[PDB]
Amino acid sequence: LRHPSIIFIDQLDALCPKREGAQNEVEKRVVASLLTLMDGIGSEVSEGQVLVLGATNRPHALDAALRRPGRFDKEIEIGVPNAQDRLDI
């Protein structure tokens, strides 16, 4: 409409944990349709107004196809603190 859209997606793991089972349900078919909107619409037509944010709960339940470069290529690790790191809490 006027593209102010800062896209943050919560419950990253709860979208599809490695596409679940996909027996009679459409979690596999809403990724490649969304892949037109990002690889195609999220990048080709955005010049900086489209950026997808998402944090993961389980590190070993996300889909491995979402770690391809150009889409979710980088990674910033936030984890346990050190003794000096938990001092200034």
Binding site: A64, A65, R67, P69, G70, D73
Partner: protein, 342 residues
């Protein structure tokens, strides 16, 4: 890959591309464009990290590619289809296994002789035989015989594994059988290598799916099923019927003439001294499967390099030491099981 590299400069040779094409497995053509984007990015990161730290007027003028930054680029960009069935023409010849003359002619009677010489079965009054069961002691020697038959004269190759299929779920085991026989009939000579089928709820409706498709290739004589097992007892008698599986061939542990041919091929590629004798090595090597005879020669040659780094010849003392470290894995109780069965 040769047409996707028509614009990007690279430094790769003919044997370097064939090594990359053979190692790439399950990559569809859409993944290879993503992989060719990542090779140009990772070479740009290598040439900026390198000790030329000049501005980029002519840094990007030359960022040629190697095999090292395709192999780095395959870490992040991974296969997209490694469950789909693909055909191949495998490269194993009969001279690599050792020369198995009598086993070759029994397999040749079921895969070539129904088409090339059909008058011989009619004058002898026997029906031409269909699919062959192979039984023997455990090892990897049975699948190399089936791969070597698929190399000498046509006969493109497809494979189904035994206990993988049984422990899977209900639905996915069904059309995996039907898709294998469909692609084997599109490709004009075909060998369907079935693995250990003595593993065969899940016990019904996979055997029943396999029975109705193997009756479909009854009249078509260009498709041959081949099966291997370690136990001849627990194959059920629905499969062992005249019409589906007739011929039974025994593949033994290697005898005295076969073990000399594996040794003589291996002594060509390595410098062996003239003080050892082959006839002492044949008698001490008894019950040594074919992979273990290759493993003795690598062990004895590595031990001679350990005692001196500048070594030209391999002596008798290393062969005595290599025979003690490598032992036969098969127990001797299973050895007389197959001798009492014969």
């Amino acid at each position: 890959l040769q047409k996707l590299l028509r614009r990007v400069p690279h430094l790769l040779t003919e044997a370097e591309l064939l090594q990359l094409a053979n190692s790439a497995h399950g990559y569809v053509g859409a993944d290879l464009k993503v992989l060719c984007n990542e090779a140009g990015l990772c070479a740009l990161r290598r040439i900026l990290k390198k000790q030329p730290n000049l501005p980029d007027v002519k840094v990007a003028g030359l960022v040629k590619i190697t095999l090292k930054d395709f192999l780095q680029a395959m870490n992040d960009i991974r296969p997209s289809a490694m469950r789909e069935i693909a055909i191949d023409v495998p490269n194993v010849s009969w001279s690599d296994i050792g020369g198995l003359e009598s086993i070759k002619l029994k397999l040749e009677q079921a895969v070539e002789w129904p088409l090339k010489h059909p008058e011989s079965f009619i004058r002898m009054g026997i029906q031409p035989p269909k699919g062959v069961l192979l039984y023997g002691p455990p090892g990897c020697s049975k699948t190399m015989i089936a791969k070597a038959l698929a190399n000498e004269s046509g006969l493109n190759f497809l494979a189904i594994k035994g206990p993988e299929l049984m422990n899977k779920y209900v639905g996915e085991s069904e059309r995996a059988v039907r898709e294998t026989f469909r692609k084997a009939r599109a490709v004009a000579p075909s060998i369907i290598f079935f693995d250990q089928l003595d593993a065969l709820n899940v016990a019904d409706r996979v055997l029943a799916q396999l029975l109705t498709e193997m009756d479909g290739i009854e009249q078509l004589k260009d498709v041959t099923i081949l099966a291997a097992t370690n136990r001849p007892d627990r194959i059920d008698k629905a499969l062992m019927r005249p019409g589906r599986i007739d011929r039974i061939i025994y593949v033994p542990l290697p005898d005295a003439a076969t073990r000399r041919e594996i040794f003589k091929l291996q002594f060509h590629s390595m410098p062996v001294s003239n003080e050892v004798d082959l006839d002492e090595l044949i008698l001490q090597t008894d019950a040594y499967s074919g992979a273990e005879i290759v493993a003795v020669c690598r062990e004895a040659a590595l031990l001679a390099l350990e005692e001196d780094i500048q070594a030209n010849l391999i002596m008798k003392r290393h062969f005595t030491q290599a025979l003690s470290t490598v032992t036969p894995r098969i127990p001797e109780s299973l050895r007389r099981f197959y001798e009492d069965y014969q």
